[model samples]
Target: MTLSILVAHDLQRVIGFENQLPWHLPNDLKHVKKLSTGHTLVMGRKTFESIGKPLPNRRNVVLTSDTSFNVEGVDVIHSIEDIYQLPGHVFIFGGQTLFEEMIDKVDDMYITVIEGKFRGDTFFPPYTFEDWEVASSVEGKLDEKNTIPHTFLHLIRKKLVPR
Candidate 1:
């Protein structure tokens, strides 16, 4: 099974500050939905709490240790090993811990690197440039209503071992 990660983070390497993002980028959210529409999105308990509910049009698999935690329309698993039983491509949509644990398993990354800095407490660790090369990129300029410049980057991990 192929594992992937999708993220939109700030310059300070923060995925979240105070359990929430410092900025709201609607386009990025749409991009996430579009890309993850047919795949399974695996996230930690805290990440699920931040969203408050299951996202529409996608299969959500939450990793939590709490036995009583349950939500309708979502599958709750205790650990990474539990997720292996599930079939199909799995995408890690993170809070922090989940990312760190599954980063090595990820085969690709769909990242939206926003052009600006904000104070944050969570972050996505950088991968080796030689191991993961940019597959594609789309530059977007700030429109009249929005002022932040952003770029959508699709990075594909290069095979380390020759087959």
Candidate 2:
């Protein structure tokens, strides 16, 4: 299965503030929805709660250790080991801890590298170019509507071949 992460982060690598994103970038959200619209989206419980509901037009799968957790229009998962129940491609949209846990399993990243630092309480998992191949990159402008200059990139991982 192809696993991906969709994010918009600052130069400081912060991805969130409190339980939500520190910045409001509408275009970025649209881009993420376009990327994972019909696929499975896996996120941690707190992240799911922060979202308040499943994203429309996609399969929402929640990762939680609490088996008792339940919600309408969302699928609950007790472990990463059981993620196979969700078919096709998966996008790991997240909070800090969830991203850290799922990073190793990710096959690619749809990253928006925001230009400047903003106040934030959460950060993305640490990684360098060594882990992935830059599949594509697009330059973006700092227009009045978007406010921030960001680069969109698709990075593909080099997984080891099994013997």
lDDT of 1 by residue, 27-145 (tens): 78878898889889999998898898999988999999999978999999998898677778778899789888877877888888877898887888867768888999997567664
Error at 17, model 2, angstroms: 0.6
Off by over 4 Å in 1: 161-163
Q: TM-scores of the models, in the given order?
A: 0.92, 0.91
Show where candidate 2 strays beyond 4 Å.
159-163
* Root-mean-square deviation per candidate: 1.9, 2.5
Please state the error at residue 83 of candidate 1 in Å. Answer: 2.3
Question: Can you give the lDDT of residue 117 in candidate 2?
Answer: 92
**Which residue pairs overlap in candidate 1's backbone?**
14-122, 15-122, 15-123
Top model number, TM-score: 1
